[PDB]
């Protein structure tokens, strides 16, 4: 009944609907999208459901909506470095993170859950993915939507990683547990990691970190090449 994580974002229904309306306004090729149907499918995935019993099947009525064009070679994957990834695509408008697609744009920076017996949106608390349960509305949404975006990637797949982290590449992150395993070797030639020196000055070649060599090994067994670049100065990287 009570959960360890923050509750549903305030005015979540209006936010999801406005975002859909705004996204289909900016992208005229998407004006065929019924935003009422989008909100109804999103709402239907988690309302009246126990927020630790959520499955990929619950999101399929939403997953089918929002078809759009994202060139396979213009995908940008990221892990634990959300701000820099989104600033990059705001500059290089041809490239997309998942949160630049309709489904990702709807849910970016939001939290949501319901209660089993009632039609109420639980605004008090929502399950913490590490403390309460992994099969919660927010975690299941991202894991389900991400897999298809990773399956789409081709040629050189770029991933931005946070080099200031204890684990630059985390095997148990959405990228590490979902996206990496859905990259298709028949279509993907190389996975290129961009290790961001976000925080403190670190003159080290972070492309030699054990977690990077671990990522190289996982991607190698799936018959894909690996490339790594250090982004020593991220603030100057955006201007370049």
């Amino acid at each position, epitope marked *: 009944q009570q959960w360890s994580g923050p509750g549903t974002t305030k005015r979540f229904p209006e936010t999801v609907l406005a975002r859909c309306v705004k996204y289909t306004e900016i992208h*005229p*090729e998407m*004006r*065929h999208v019924d935003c009422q149907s989008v909100w109804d499918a999103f709402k239907g995935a988690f309302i009246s459901k126990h927020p630790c019993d959520i499955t*990929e*099947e619950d999101y*399929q*009525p939403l*997953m*089918k909506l929002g*078809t*759009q*064009t*994202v*060139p*396979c*070679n213009k995908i940008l994957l990221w892990s634990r470095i959300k701000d820099l990834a989104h600033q990059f695509t705001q500059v290089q408008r041809d490239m997309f993170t998942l949160e630049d*697609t309709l489904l990702g744009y709807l849910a970016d920076d939001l939290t949501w859950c319901g209660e089993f017996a009632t039609s109420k949106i639980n605004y008090q608390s929502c399950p913490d993915w590490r403390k309460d349960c992994s099969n919660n509305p927010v975690s299941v949404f991202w894991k389900t939507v991400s*897999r*298809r*975006f990773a*399956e*789409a990637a*081709c*040629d050189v797949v770029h991933v931005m990683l946070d080099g200031s982290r204890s684990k630059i590449f985390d095997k148990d992150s959405t990228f590490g547990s979902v996206e990496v395993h*859905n990259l*298709q070797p*028949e279509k993907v030639q190389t996975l290129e990691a961009w290790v961001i020196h976000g925080g403190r000055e670190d003159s080290r070649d972070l492309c030699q970190d054990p977690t990077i060599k671990e990522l190289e090994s996982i991607i190698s067994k799936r018959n894909i090449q690996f490339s790594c670049k250090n982004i020593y100065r991220p603030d100057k990287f955006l201007q370049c």
Partner: antibody, heavy 120, light 108 residues
Framework: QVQLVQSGAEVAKPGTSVKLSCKASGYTFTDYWMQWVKQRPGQGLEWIGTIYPGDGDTGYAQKFQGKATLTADKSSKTVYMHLSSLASEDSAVYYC?????????????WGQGTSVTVSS | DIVMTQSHLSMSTSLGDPVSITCKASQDVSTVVAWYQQKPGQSPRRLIYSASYRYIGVPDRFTGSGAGTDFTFTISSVQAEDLAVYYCQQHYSPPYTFGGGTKLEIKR
């Protein structure tokens, strides 16, 4: 490697039914619309309808509503198209094709087609 | 249903020359039009989609343009392997209707 493998050629008497199959491999079956296209001998392509296997939602062009029924078997990663009350005009090659979700549902991978011949 | 009209059923060309095929939609389909190539006894193959997008590996001699109700597919330099039937399709709103096809044959 994405592949769509369709069932073999069918021959049917008028008024009977036929169920065609399309087995998908190399991608997450539930996450893409599967669409079907008819091609009468020597004629052009005609869009029949579609199914989203993740939730079973379907839709058909007016011409084929009441003629075609699409279903999906998630365990076998197979989409089926059932054609009822067969007539000579139903003789054609039927293709299944995947809608590219990040290609605005254009048809990226195609099956090899199933020939259906309806005759007495 | 939206009607897609390819006004030329057949076009004669020469190897190395450019060819353009036109398609007209009965209603606005924004930029969401695809072009498929089909050879005898083969399944159709997507060449262009969303009016002008081309999947990695599809030859750059194939281009698409257009928006609204008028679309064009061009082969900048016809190769022997390009003699086939070309179909436009709108993939904007279901039913995702096809044009009637245009067969490209060689002049002699």
């Amino acid at each position: 490697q994405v592949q769509l493998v369709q069932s073999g050629a069918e021959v049917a008497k008028p008024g009977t039914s036929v169920k065609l199959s399309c087995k998908a491999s190399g991608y997450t079956f539930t996450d893409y619309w599967m669409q079907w296209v008819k091609q009468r001998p020597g004629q052009g392509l005609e869009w029949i309808g579609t199914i989203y296997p993740g939730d079973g939602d379907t839709g058909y062009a007016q011409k084929f509503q009441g003629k075609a029924t699409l279903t999906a078997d998630k365990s076998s990663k197979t989409v089926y198209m059932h054609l009822s009350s067969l007539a000579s005009e139903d003789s054609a090659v039927y293709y299944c094709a995947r809608g590219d979700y990040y290609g605005s549902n254009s048809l990226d991978y195609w099956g090899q087609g199933t020939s259906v011949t309806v005759s007495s | 249903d939206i009607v897609m009209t390819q006004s030329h059923l057949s076009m004669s060309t020469s190897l190395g020359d450019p060819v353009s095929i036109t398609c007209k939609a009965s209603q606005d389909v924004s930029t969401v039009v695809a072009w498929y190539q089909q050879k005898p006894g083969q399944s159709p193959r997507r060449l262009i989609y969303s009016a002008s997008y081309r999947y990695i590996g599809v030859p750059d001699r194939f281009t698409g343009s257009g928006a609204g109700t008028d679309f064009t597919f061009t082969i900048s330099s016809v190769q022997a392997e390009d003699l086939a039937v070309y179909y436009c399709q709108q993939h904007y709103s279901p039913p995702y209707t096809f044009g009637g096809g245009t067969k490209l044959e060689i002049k002699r």
